[PDB]
């Protein structure tokens, strides 16, 4: 798929993504905080359509992600991210997508997620996260 | 004067400031790098005019600041930043302004300047810098 | 189990752990680097014995951990770390233990693991890792 790298910012205000209950995650877009102001990152879209949209609006800065988990698995011969769940200090969002395949999770004891990068073809092929204090 | 805070970024691409060789530093504005793209910082202007403009264009990313130095002292009753010099791994820019008063300098062995904050009235009252790896 | 917190260091030179092909991870001890000098971390031993010891001597500083993965599962009514694998830029060490239960992996693109903390009773109950640049 096509690779993307949003880079690092100072926080996260909102996450927008789409999924399909029969395949995996499709589109991925994030509204970051940049020194107190909202910074809208580019919308990384799937080469196709038919995904169900979801908007995660965080009550920044009192609300922040404490753990990210999901599932990776095979779909049409490719390994992709099929599901994602975002847990903050106030609520849990998800899971979104097919909870099938190999699970993974990243609990944060001290620090913050401040950016994303990855690759999206038909689906989200893979992704990483920027962490900072 | 009026306080300002640009916040932290990915690096420095260009510094635009104005000064008066017989008084102190006036205007101050920075073009930062934000994850590979240029980000034009707010222009922090002096309450008055009549300064000499200076543009410092850096060969980003191979060129970066290694030392910031200058002088502080009075102009009428106020204590301000009378002079500034910027030394990179390629050239030295300045000094700009009254090179007299109380000297100060910040050399950097390892790290980068990624942001500025301070205050400006008729002249640059004071300033601080953001450092990161 | 009995909790422990090694704290953060300059790097990792060697990992000594023990396991049992029928249960989980037993003992755990790390030899860190402290500003160029080896620093022997405290040895966190299991309440019981009968484990198979393993010594992982890294060719510090050219070789370092890039990914830590393993499995957590149930043993005698307790959720514990049943297996561990360490992948460096030169070799893969493991898996050690039993790969049954729920998997987890932490791959690092940029940064290093500089410390460990957790709890050990009969087996390794849980653990966290300190990350730094």
């Amino acid at each position: 798929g096509k690779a993307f790298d949003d880079g690092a910012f100072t926080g996260i205000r909102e996450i927008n993504l789409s999924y399909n209950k029969e395949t995996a995650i499709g589109d991925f877009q994030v509204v970051y905080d940049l020194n107190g102001s909202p910074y809208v990152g580019q919308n990384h879209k799937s080469f196709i359509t038919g995904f169900t949209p979801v908007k995660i609006s965080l009550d920044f800065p009192s609300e922040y992600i404490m753990e990210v988990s999901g599932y990776t698995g095979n779909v049409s011969g490719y390994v992709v991210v099929r599901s994602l769940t975002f847990k903050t200090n106030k609520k849990t969002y998800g899971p979104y997508g097919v909870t099938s395949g190999t699970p993974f999770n990243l609990p944060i004891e001290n620090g913050l997620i401040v950016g994303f990068k990855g690759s999206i073809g038909y689906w989200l092929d893979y992704f990483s996260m920027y962490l900072s204090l | 004067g009026k306080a300002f805070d640009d916040g932290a970024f990915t690096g420095i691409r260009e510094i635009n400031l104005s000064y008066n060789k017989e008084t102190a530093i006036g205007d101050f504005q920075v073009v930062y790098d934000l994850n590979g793209s240029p980000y034009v910082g707010q222009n922090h202007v002096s309450f008055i005019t009549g300064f000499t403009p200076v543009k410092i264009s850096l060969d980003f990313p191979s060129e970066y600041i290694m030392e910031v130095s200058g002088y502080t002292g009075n102009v009428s009753g106020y204590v301000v930043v009378r002079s500034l010099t910027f030394k990179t791994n390629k050239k030295t820019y300045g000094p700009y302004g009254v090179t007299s008063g109380t000297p100060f300098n910040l050399p950097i062995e390892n790290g980068l300047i990624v942001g500025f904050k301070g205050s400006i009235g008729y002249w640059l009252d004071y300033f601080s810098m953001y450092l990161s790896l | 189990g009995k909790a422990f917190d090694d704290g953060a260091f300059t790097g990792i030179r060697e990992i000594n752990l023990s396991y049992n092909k029928e249960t989980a991870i037993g003992d755990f001890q790390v030899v860190y680097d402290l500003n160029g000098s080896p620093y022997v971390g405290q040895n966190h031993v299991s309440f019981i014995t009968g484990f198979t010891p393993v010594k992982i001597s890294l060719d510090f500083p050219s070789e370092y951990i890039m990914e830590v993965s393993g499995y957590t599962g149930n043993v005698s009514g307790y959720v514990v770390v049943r297996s561990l694998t360490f992948k460096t830029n030169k070799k893969t060490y493991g898996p050690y233990g039993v790969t049954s239960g729920t998997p987890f992996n932490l791959p690092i693109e940029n940064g290093l693991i500089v410390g460990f903390k957790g709890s050990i009773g009969y087996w390794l109950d849980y653990f966290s890792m300190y990350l730094s640049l």
């Binding site: 999901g70 992709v80 991210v81 990855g118 092929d125 962490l131 | 790896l133 | 791959p107 730094s132």
Partner: peptide, 18 residues
């Protein structure tokens, strides 16, 4: 070093990159 700020990056999860 270069003039680009860096931070810790964990991942990736999904298709293998290395």
């Amino acid at each position: 070093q270069s003039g680009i700020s860096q931070t810790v990056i964990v991942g990736p999860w999904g298709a293998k990159s290395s």
